[PDB]
Scaffold this active site. Structure first.
Site, PDB file in Angstrom:
ATOM      1  N   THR A   1       0.827  -1.199   0.000  1.00 39.68           N
ATOM      2  CA  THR A   1       0.000   0.000   0.000  1.00 39.68           C
ATOM      3  C   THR A   1       0.865   1.253   0.000  1.00 39.68           C
ATOM      4  OG1 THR A   1      -1.765  -1.128   1.234  1.00 39.68           O
ATOM      5  CG2 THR A   1      -1.835   1.274   1.170  1.00 39.68           C
ATOM      6  N   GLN A   2       0.608   2.146  -0.958  1.00 39.32           N
ATOM      7  CA  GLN A   2       1.258   3.444  -0.989  1.00 39.32           C
ATOM      8  C   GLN A   2       0.402   4.562  -0.415  1.00 39.32           C
ATOM      9  OE1 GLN A   2       4.492   3.794  -1.808  1.00 39.32           O
ATOM     10  NE2 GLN A   2       4.410   1.558  -1.988  1.00 39.32           N
TER      11      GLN A   2
ATOM     12  N   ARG B   1      -5.389  -3.207  -5.023  1.00 40.19           N
ATOM     13  CA  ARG B   1      -5.860  -1.906  -4.552  1.00 40.19           C
ATOM     14  C   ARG B   1      -5.089  -0.732  -5.138  1.00 40.19           C
ATOM     15  NH1 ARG B   1      -2.953  -4.638  -1.084  1.00 40.19           N
ATOM     16  NH2 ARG B   1      -1.138  -3.664  -0.088  1.00 40.19           N
TER      17      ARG B   1
ATOM     18  N   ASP C   1      -4.978  -3.035   5.555  1.00 40.20           N
ATOM     19  CA  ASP C   1      -3.684  -3.619   5.876  1.00 40.20           C
ATOM     20  C   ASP C   1      -3.725  -4.344   7.215  1.00 40.20           C
ATOM     21  OD1 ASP C   1      -2.550  -2.761   3.518  1.00 40.20           O
ATOM     22  OD2 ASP C   1      -1.782  -0.891   4.371  1.00 40.20           O
TER      23      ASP C   1
ATOM     24  N   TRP D   1       0.669   0.405   6.354  1.00 38.03           N
ATOM     25  CA  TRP D   1       0.444   1.711   6.974  1.00 38.03           C
ATOM     26  C   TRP D   1      -0.353   1.538   8.267  1.00 38.03           C
ATOM     27  CZ3 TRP D   1       2.991   5.863   5.064  1.00 38.03           C
ATOM     28  CH2 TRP D   1       3.514   5.745   3.770  1.00 38.03           C
TER      29      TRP D   1
END
Lengths: 238, 241, 230, 212, 215, 237, 200, 118, 123, 201
Positions: free
Chosen positions: E1-2, J91, E59, E107
């Site tokens: 995940t960014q 995602r 997450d 995150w």
């Protein structure tokens, strides 16, 4: 014979012969005795020298502060499996920051030794290992075989002429839980002495000792370090 | 004939695979393990042959926890049984990771059937030497129990028996008014049947491994506790006099 | 997988498995191909071992393209695999060149595939022989492919069971100036030279190729020709 | 996104005739906020060598776990303990093995060599090293450096004998320079972890610092 | 995940004599929007370990099934071994450092609570693998608001009971709801002790607004 | 069933691989080598076995330098042991690079022994081996524990030996070493006794051309004995 | 960091300073910028200290490997070419390195200049560093092939002294080496302030 | 017989693969007989349901298998090959629906299964 | 890929395949090499050349580098493969080192390649 | 784009608009956004059309495969887990908001929401899409517990029509589905059948 070439070929009676040749290779090796007290686990291994001008072959392999290994059979297969389980302990300390439990470790040992007995053209690792370990539930003496079968034993003896040592450990089995460390090591020394011929006795040169437990890293006593433990051993009754 | 009995990938002139029959015989010389599914659970009982007195209690376990609702009963080579137990555990973990709920026992039995028989098609791998039993409980499907042999065939069962004395224990299971009667006497009758089918002359003294799954543990598989085990042992011994 | 070739030299220097596949071809159904002045006719036995078979469900004469057809003698599923391979190669040629594929080039590529099937490790040669018909450049084309991977261009040829008698019959009855209808008549008569039992429009399969392309004879036309000849 | 966070921290090491001293602050912080007041950056490698590592705390933990794995691997491979120069070689090679993605750490190695003499090894984040009598690393490194340069290294000095370094003078010097470090460096404070490597082993003590 | 899309706000935890208490609200914030109000951010690992976290919830949902899988892997062997809170600390530290290492980190920042072998345990793992232990821990705006009060209490009284710690975290969440714009007046409180891990559902704090009359 | 139709990993009924027994048999077809470990150093002395007057004796190499403080002595196939000695040299330079220090002679011994049994025909990587080496090696060096001599065999078994003899006449030369070795034995006595035993076991007359001698001493590098020095060592024998 | 080297009638003179900085802060004043590759070959270090040190250490490993496998001492040219080979692979990914390889081989005294940019230049005279031009100005007046040993020592020492006086990143102590036909020797390590007092 | 033609699928001197005939002689090892008849508006399969043991679950011992809604099948042979072939046929039907977007025809599906058999 | 080991241990330890290769060597033409003081002289026994066969295509003397040349005894095509490998190794060494090869180096390389052909499956 | 669903005693009610745009131009006005996954499992798609279509087709294919394999009707929770895994695993490239509502005999009618990022939660009523944010207060003020089927349809139509009026990205017609024990009932409201609301200023 037709059914003793490969591990994937089955006899009419339902036996795999090549695995039995692997355990015969284990029986070819010299004897070691794994015995545990309430607080300690001791491996007494009989070392052998190929000649008088050659040193005695090493048989006890320390791995971790709670785990040590004594071997019987092929030395190189023992080295390979021992290094694999060394890096398993290293991974457990690296990721989990805890010593690896002994039981799941030997379960993984059986898991690895399961695969060469089911694939074509591949041999089981011809060595049987006695395992001294400690974890939160106490000390452990385990045994693993090339047949991918692991057994928990209070006391065990493997190698050449190990039947006499097995009889000696069976005759004194209720005492090992209450015997102290010195008495446990003396009993293991007498058991390994029972494997020996009547014309040869225990010396410092051919005995390796590996001890683990409370307030004790797995320490290997060799040569002169065996000399205090040889002290106090009674002579052989006729 | 020669050459037809060496590989699992060759047929007999009659159409048989000799290696699968040798796997059957490697099952048939193993100790007797039985498993009975009743109205509120599945209870397994394993005869554990104590070959040496040096082994600690808890050695050579044939009852496994495949999943938190799924229990395991094997007879044969213990290495193949442990490998297939790990395979079933990984499949249950994969089911949970992909789907998020409990795996139906028919599904997991199918998967282990697929993973057992897939090694009976090739000369490069050998068939497993172990027959086994899967038992689970859920509120929606009730109790369910399945039988899988090294040939990879899964059959549903109300109760079954494998090992050296599979026929005698099967006939003993056939004598029970069973679909209405509770787990707490299922385990006692399992103890009685296991002690009946054990041959004390040709085998050493053994241990009675026992486990269940069902409503009394809310569908969770567990080993039988000590007092219940010795109660079933006393009932079985008192039925032998 | 096996990397060892199942087709190797005998000490005599022959390829024994190619001879075995040829023997399997000789046990196959007859396939008669005649290249006329304005097309090629392919005819084959379509005898079913029972009346319960759905005859029109499974065929033996299939078009690779609009103007290319094929028939075989030997093994059914190997022929099906070769039809798959030939259709894919012809569509590869169409993707590259957006023109109809010449018959000889498709013959070359199918023969190359069946050649490497006689060399590659762990695989077996196909138990088929092929008669490939086509029309290109205003000309009809007829070829045969053998289990050795060799390929021979033919004006008239017969394969399958009793292929020697069919070849002799065609040698005694082929003309270069034969029309398409007379080629159909000669092909059906050549099938009559090796057929056992009374012929129907359902126990044979005939297709033709001409300037309009390749297409199969309907059972109405087959029974009309059978009433015309007999 | 940023993979590196400066957590502060000041470490120091000094080498004597038969001893070494490794000291570190215990404050671990971020920006203008303290994560914890008790993070001693002196970690035990051997009976004769202590590591000292400052900078990115996750990089510090990664360095410690990697170096102890290499420790145990060498004990199993060669059946004997470290030599301190080989430890310096291990740390330099480990730092340079990720030159394109470095650890954000300044490192010092403090202990005994093979002759029992003090040995201090200074490192950069990208693998350069040198053996020194003394080295200060971290956020307040360059401030504590010239005090060792003129008091211990005798720089900008005239007309007095270069006296041998005793233990009491060394520990007094370390305490005074770390008091000065707490008084100015905002990442330095709370407490001070000091370990002394002699032939008998390594001994530990802790001095309370300022808390702001 | 960014890019975390819906995040979790401050999570508090503090030691007491015989256990550790960790409290957090169920507000999943769609950036500025208070999207979800009943999604638990406090989850029990086993009898002796429990987790809470701030940040992205997808997450930490992934973290939930992976932690459940490795826990169930632990009891399915049946050896008797169980995951200590420190081993879970080490595994979480390794996993977050690995995720930060290949430039796709998780995150989430975790406060981990435990009570084993007669000893309480409170640990902190951030989004970049920095991990440390402290008697009192807080995340986000709580790490700027509640933990000054926590440190002030600890400096004059290092050893607390369960009711004192409960009142302290109640006051800290009253302050947090007073000041955090990403806060909600609906929280859960869990406690790990020797008897196990207990989660309490419907919990809100009293609000004072008399100052609004002091214009 | 002939003996060629079994795999390289097929075990004997006693429990050993057939190929390693064949390599042990091939040891006995090699030249005679004697290593003696003393407190003054380790000496190695290997027969060249010159088979032709056109054969250049300096082209016959038996004693090799692993590195400046470790040398080796040979019995067996030349082509395999060339690769083994190259592996030993690469390992010494690898440890010298990474650790900035030399390893022990024993570390050399296990690093060369662990590739002995890495042979197989099934699932083998590109670079694997079809038959084990028929090479026995004597590693003589000086490390932090003093002068050291080790024996390595194709089975991977490595042992510490005070005085070891390998080759065609290994048993008789070993009995000779048994009746000449003592723990108080000097390096010069080791050299003289080793050349005496080579003289009594070789089928030729011992001269400076068909033998090789080397010494490893503490405080000194690996030394190759020149032909003149070999002659004056011969002179008192 | 200023290093220099020049060949002359009695061999090769190599001279270096010892100042290393971290940004504007002087990290150290005792850094050895000349690596001793073997008893007949030396290498200089200038620029990225980690890069220079690790690649020269790998060069030492490779030349020892060559000596082990071929029983021959490595020439200066072949060593410089293998150095250019293993630095050419990592070109453009941030390597900062500049070195002079000096030695004695079968052809005699050999001096080469290699960098992290793939340059490999043979020449009688070279100097690498930020203050290399300050050394260059002195040595172009001082250099001659017919120079003896002592005035070559003085020329190299004075050029390094001028560079350390004129360059901020140069300082510490002057280390001198003399490669001859029997190998190199270590000449001196003289302090800069003492040199200033001597030359005043 | 020439070589290992009795053991694997290589040609005989008659050109016959003996392992195919061995597959035919392994079909009948189940001891079952299945009859499938097409009617004017229906298709019907009748197979044997042998339950020799009452402990066997009658719901689990079955041979009528369902590929998708429209297509069903009856099976001959041994049970592991039975489930394997029905699983592969279900997977191929699902792939046909995922690629071409409609339910697979019966002729096309049996063509794919027999090609897998080839 | 074909992975059958051609050369294995016999029970007496000899390698039959290498001995058969030696027999093929001894079946080949005679090549004599003599090292002089400032010269090296090679001489190969020319076979009876066919009257329509070109003698330039049957030359058994070839150069491997500009200072190093060779003569062979045995199969011509295997020797051509050996020569081609030696040439590409000489050019690779000249690229890597900026020096031409030595005689011992290229001899060591080609004999190591030959021994590698003794120690693999399917070769 | 506006999508929503309400759970009632007996099942679920799904409602959606029909405007699909790219930029300020209406690409389609009658897009059916109540995408069927299974015979009593429907999903509502918002965001990128290709991404939503691909994930819906993949989940439908996999769910049909698993339901055939298990020979059981698919759980709405299991389908929602499949959507959650696909949306969380991809995602970083999809723009999708899915509202999955269905009925199974095991758990009745269920509503699950998979928003951007791949979260999963069960709820009595789910709101999603571009128009979603403009009706929150209304759907926090009108919903009542234990709500009936036809009044779920009335609530759905009213909230949908309010989002129709407020959002320029919402437009076209009103599409409704109701999933219960009897199956799926589908309806379209258009023109005067759309519930009007007084905007008089």
């Amino acid at each position: 014979n037709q059914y003793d070439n490969d591990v994937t070929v089955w006899s009419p009676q339902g036996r795999i012969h090549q695995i039995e040749y692997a355990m015969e290779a284990v029986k070819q090796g010299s004897a070691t005795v794994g015995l545990k007290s309430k607080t300690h686990a001791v491996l007494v291994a009989l070392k052998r020298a190929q000649s008088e001008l050659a040193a005695h072959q090493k048989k006890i392999l320390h791995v971790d502060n709670h785990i040590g290994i004594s071997i019987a059979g092929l030395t190189a297969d023992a080295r390979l499996l021992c290094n694999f389980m060394r890096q398993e302990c290293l991974d457990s300390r690296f990721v989990f920051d805890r010593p690896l439990p002994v039981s799941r470790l030997v379960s993984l040992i059986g898991s690895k030794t399961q695969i060469p007995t089911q694939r074509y053209g591949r041999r089981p690792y011809g060595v049987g290992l006695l395992i001294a370990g400690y974890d939160d539930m106490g000390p452990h003496i385990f045994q693993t075989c090339p047949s991918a079968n692991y057994f928990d034993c209070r006391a065990m003896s493997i190698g050449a002429r190990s039947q006499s040592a097995r009889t000696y450990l069976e005759r004194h089995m209720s005492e090992f839980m209450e015997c102290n460390l010195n008495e446990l090591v003396k009993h293991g020394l007498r058991a390994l002495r029972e494997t020996l011929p009547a014309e040869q006795d225990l010396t410092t040169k051919n005995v390796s000792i590996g001890i683990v437990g409370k307030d004790l890293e797995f320490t290997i006593y060799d040569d002169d370090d065996v000399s205090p433990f040889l002290e106090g051993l009674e002579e052989r009754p006729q | 004939g020669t050459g037809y009995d060496l590989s699992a990938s060759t047929f007999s002139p009659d159409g048989r695979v000799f290696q699968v029959e040798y796997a059957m015989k490697a099952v048939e010389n193993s100790s007797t393990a039985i498993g009975i599914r009743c109205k509120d659970g599945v209870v397994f009982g394993v005869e554990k042959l104590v070959l040496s007195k040096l082994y600690e209690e808890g050695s050579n376990k044939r009852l496994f926890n495949v999943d938190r609702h799924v229990g395991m009963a094997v007879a044969g080579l213990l290495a193949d049984a442990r490998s297939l137990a790990d395979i079933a555990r990984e499949e249950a973990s994969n089911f949970r990771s992909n789907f998020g709920y409990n795996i139906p026992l028919k599904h997991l039995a199918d998967r282990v059937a697929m993973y057992v028989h897939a090694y009976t098609l090739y000369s490069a791998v050998r068939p497993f030497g172990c027959s086994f039993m899967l038992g689970s409980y859920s509120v929606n499907d009730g109790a369910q129990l399945y039988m899988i042999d090294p040939s990879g065939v899964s059959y549903g069962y109300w109760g079954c028996a494998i090992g050296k004395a599979r026929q005698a224990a099967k006939t003993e299971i056939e004598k029970l008014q069973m679909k209405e009667m509770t787990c707490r006497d299922i385990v006692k009758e399992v103890a009685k049947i296991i002690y009946i089918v054990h041959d004390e002359v040709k085998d050493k003294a053994f241990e009675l491994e026992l486990s269940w799954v069902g409503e009394l543990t809310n569908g969770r598989h567990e080993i039988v506790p000590k007092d219940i085990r010795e109660e079933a042992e006393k009932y079985a011994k008192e039925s032998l006099k | 997988g096996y990397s060892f070739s199942l087709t190797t030299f005998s000490p005599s220097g022959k390829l024994v498995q190619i001879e075995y596949a040829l023997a399997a071809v000789a046990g196959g159904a007859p396939s008669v191909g005649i290249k006329a002045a304005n097309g090629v006719v392919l005819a084959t036995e379509k005898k079913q071992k029972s009346i319960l078979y759905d005859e029109r469900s499974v065929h033996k004469v299939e078009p690779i393209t609009k103007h290319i057809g094929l028939v075989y003698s030997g093994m059914g599923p190997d022929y099906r695999v070769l039809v798959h391979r030939a259709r894919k190669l012809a569509q590869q040629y169409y993707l590259v060149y957006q023109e109809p594929i010449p018959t000889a080039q498709l013959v070359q590529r199918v023969a190359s595939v069946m050649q490497e099937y006689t060399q590659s490790g762990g695989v077996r040669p196909f138990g088929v022989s092929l008669l490939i018909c086509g029309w290109n450049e205003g000309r009809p084309y007829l070829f045969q492919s053998d289990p050795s991977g060799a390929y021979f261009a033919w004006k008239a040829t017969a394969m399958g069971k009793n292929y020697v008698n069919g070849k002799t019959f065609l040698e005694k009855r082929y003309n270069e100036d034969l029309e398409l209808e007379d080629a159909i008549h000669t092909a059906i008569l050549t099938l009559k030279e090796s057929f056992e039992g009374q012929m129907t429009e359902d126990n044979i399969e005939v297709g033709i190729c001409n300037e309009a392309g390749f297409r199969r004879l309907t059972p109405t036309e087959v029974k009309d020709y059978l009433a015309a000849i007999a | 996104f940023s993979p590196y966070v400066f957590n502060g921290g000041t470490i120091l090491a000094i080498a004597g005739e038969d001893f070494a001293i490794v000291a570190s602050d215990t404050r671990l912080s971020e920006g203008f906020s303290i994560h914890t007041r008790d993070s001693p950056k002196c970690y035990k490698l051997t009976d004769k060598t202590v590591i000292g590592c400052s900078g990115f705390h996750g990089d510090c933990l990664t360095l410690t776990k990697i170096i102890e794995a290499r420790l145990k691997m060498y004990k199993h491979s060669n059946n004997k303990a470290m030599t301190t120069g080989a430890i310096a070689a291990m740390l330099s090679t480990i730092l340079y093995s990720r030159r394109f993605f470095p650890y954000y750490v300044y490192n010092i190695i403090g202990g005994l060599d093979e002759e029992g003499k003090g040995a201090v090894y200074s490192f950069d984040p990208v693998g350069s090293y040198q053996r020194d009598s003394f080295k200060a690393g971290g956020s307040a490194s360059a401030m504590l450096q010239p005090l060792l340069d003129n008091q211990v290294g005798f720089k900008n000095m005239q007309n007095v004998e270069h006296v041998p370094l005793s233990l009491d003078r060394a520990m007094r010097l370390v305490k005074d320079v770390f008091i000065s470090a707490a008084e100015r460096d905002v990442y330095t404070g709370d407490a001070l972890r000091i370990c002394i490597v002699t032939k008998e082993g390594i001994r530990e003590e802790t001095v309370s610092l300022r808390k702001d | 995940t960014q890019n975390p899309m819906v995040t979790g706000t401050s999570v508090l935890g503090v030691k007491f004599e015989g256990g550790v208490v960790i409290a957090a609200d169920m507000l999943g914030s769609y950036g500025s929007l208070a999207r979800f109000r009943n999604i638990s951010r406090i989850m029990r690992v086993n009898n002796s370990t429990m987790l809470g976290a701030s940040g992205d919830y997808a997450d930490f949902q992934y973290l939930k099934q992976v932690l459940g899988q490795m826990v169930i892997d632990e009891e399915l062997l049946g050896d008797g071994h169980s995951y200590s809170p420190r081993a879970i600390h080490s595994w979480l530290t390794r996993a977050m450092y690995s995720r930060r290492s290949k430039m796709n980190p998780l995150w989430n920042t975790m406060v981990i609570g435990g009570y084993a072998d007669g000893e309480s345990f409170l640990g902190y793992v951030d989004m970049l693998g920095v991990a440390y232990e402290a008697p009192s821990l807080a995340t986000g705006y709580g790490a700027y608001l509640a933990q000054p009060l926590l440190r002030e209490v600890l400096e004059k009284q290092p050893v607390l009971s369960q009711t004192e710690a409960r009142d302290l975290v109640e006051r800290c969440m009253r302050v947090l709801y007073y000041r955090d714009a990403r806060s909600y007046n609906r929280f859960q409180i869990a406690t790990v002790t020797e008897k196990g891990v207990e989660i309490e559902g419907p919990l809100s704090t009293e609000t004072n607004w008399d100052i609004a009359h002091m214009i | 069933r002939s003996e060629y139709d079994r795999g390289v990993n097929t075990f004997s009924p006693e429990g050993r691989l057939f190929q390693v027994e064949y390599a042990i048999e091939a040891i006995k077809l090699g030249s005679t080598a004697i290593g003696i470990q003393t407190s003054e150093g380790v000496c190695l002395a290997v027969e060249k076995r010159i088979t032709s007057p056109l054969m250049e004796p300096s082209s016959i190499e038996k004693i090799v330098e692993i590195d400046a403080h470790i040398g080796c002595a040979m019995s067996g196939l030349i082509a395999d042991a060339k690769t083994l000695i190259d592996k030993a040299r690469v390992e010494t330079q690898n440890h010298w690079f990474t650790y900035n220090e030399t390893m022990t002679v024993e570390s050399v011994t296990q690093a060369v022994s662990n590739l002995a049994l890495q042979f197989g025909e099934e699932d083998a990587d590109p670079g694997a081996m079809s038959r084990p080496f028929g090479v026995a090696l004597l590693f003589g060096g000086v490390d932090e524990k003093g002068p050291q001599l080790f024996h390595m065999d194709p089975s991977g078994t490595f042992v510490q030996c005070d005085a070891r003899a390998i080759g065609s006449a290994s048993e008789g030369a070993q009995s000779s070493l048994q009746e000449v070795y003592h723990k108080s034995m000097t390096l010069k006595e080791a050299i003289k006794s080793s050349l005496i035993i080579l003289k009594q076991v070789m089928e030729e007359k011992l001269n400076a051309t068909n033998i090789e001698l080397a010494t490893v001493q503490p405080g000194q590098n690996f030394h190759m004995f020149t032909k003149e020095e070999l002659e004056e060592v011969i002179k008192d024998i | 960091t200023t290093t220099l080297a020049f060949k002359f009638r009695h061999g090769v003179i190599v001279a270096a300073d010892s100042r290393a900085t971290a940004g504007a802060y002087i990290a150290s004043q005792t850094v050895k910028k000349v690596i001793e590759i073997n008893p007949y070959l030396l290498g200089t270090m200038a620029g990225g200290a980690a890069d220079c040190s690790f690649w020269e250490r790998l060069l030492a490993r490779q030349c020892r490997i060559y000596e082990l496998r071929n029983k021959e001492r490595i020439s200066v040219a072949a060593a410089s070419k293998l150095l250019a080979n293993m630095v050419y692979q990592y070109k453009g990914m941030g390597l900062s390195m500049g070195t002079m390889i000096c030695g004695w081989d079968k052809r005699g005294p050999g001096l080469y200049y290699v960098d992290s940019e793939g340059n490999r230049i043979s020449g009688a005279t070279f100097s690498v560093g930020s203050g290399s031009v300050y050394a260059y100005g002195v040595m172009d007046r001082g250099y001659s092939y017919d120079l003896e040993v002592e005035q070559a020592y003085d020329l190299a020492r004075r050029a390094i002294y001028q560079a350390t006086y004129r360059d901020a990143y140069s300082g510490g102590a002057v280390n001198l080496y003399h490669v001859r036909e029997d190998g190199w020797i270590r000449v001196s390590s003289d302090n800069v302030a003492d040199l200033h007092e001597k030359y005043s | 017989s020439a070589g290992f033609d009795r053991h694997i699928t290589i040609f005989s001197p008659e050109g016959r693969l003996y392992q195919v005939e061995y597959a035919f002689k392994a079909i009948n090892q189940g001891g079952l007989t299945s009859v499938a008849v097409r009617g004017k508006d229906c298709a019907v399969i009748v197979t044997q349901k042998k339950v020799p043991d009452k402990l066997l679950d009658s719901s689990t011992v079955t041979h009528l298998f369902k590929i998708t809604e429209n297509i069903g099948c009856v099976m001959t042979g041994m049970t592991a090959d039975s489930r394997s072939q029905v699983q592969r046929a279900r997977y191929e039907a699902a792939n046909w629906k995922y690629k071409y977007g409609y339910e697979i025809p019966v002729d096309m599906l049996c063509k794919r299964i027999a090609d897998i058999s080839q | 890929s074909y992975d059958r080991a051609i050369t294995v241990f016999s029970p007496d330890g000899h390698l039959f395949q290498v001995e058969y290769a030696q027999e093929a060597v001894k079946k080949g033409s005679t090549a004599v090499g003599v090292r002089g003081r400032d010269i090296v002289v090679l001489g190969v026994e020319k076979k009876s050349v066919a009257k329509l066969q070109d003698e330039r295509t049957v030359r058994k003397i070839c150069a491997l580098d500009d200072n190093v040349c060779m003569a062979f005894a045995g199969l011509t095509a295997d020797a051509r493969i050996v020569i081609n490998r030696a040439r590409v190794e000489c050019q690779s060494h000249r690229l890597t080192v900026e020096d031409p090869v030595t005689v011992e180096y290229i001899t060591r390389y080609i004999a190591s390649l030959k021994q590698r052909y003794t120690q693999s499956n399917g070769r | 784009t506006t999508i929503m669903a309400v759970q009632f005693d007996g099942g679920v009610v799904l409602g959606a608009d029909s405007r699909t745009t790219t930029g300020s131009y209406i690409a389609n006005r009658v897009t059916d956004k109540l995408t069927p996954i299974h015979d009593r499992i429907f999903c509502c798609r918002s965001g990128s059309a290709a991404d939503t279509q691909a994930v819906a087709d993949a989940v439908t294919y996999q769910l049909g495969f698993h339901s055939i394999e298990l020979n059981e009707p698919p759980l709405v929770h299991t389908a929602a887990s499949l959507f959650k895994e696909m949306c969380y695993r991809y995602r970083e490239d999809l723009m999708a908001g899915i509202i999955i509502a269905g009925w199974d005999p095991q758990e009745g009618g269920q509503v699950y929401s998979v928003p951007m990022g791949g979260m999963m939660v069960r709820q009595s009523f789910a709101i999603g899409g571009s128009g979603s944010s403009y009706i929150y207060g209304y759907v926090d003020a009108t919903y009542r517990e234990g709500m009936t089927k036809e009044e779920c349809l009335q609530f759905t139509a009213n909230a949908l029509a309010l989002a129709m009026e407020r959002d320029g990205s919402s437009g076209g017609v009103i599409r409704l589905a109701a999933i219960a024990e009897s199956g799926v009932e589908r309806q379209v409201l258009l023109g005067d059948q759309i519930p009007k609301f007084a905007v008089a200023t």
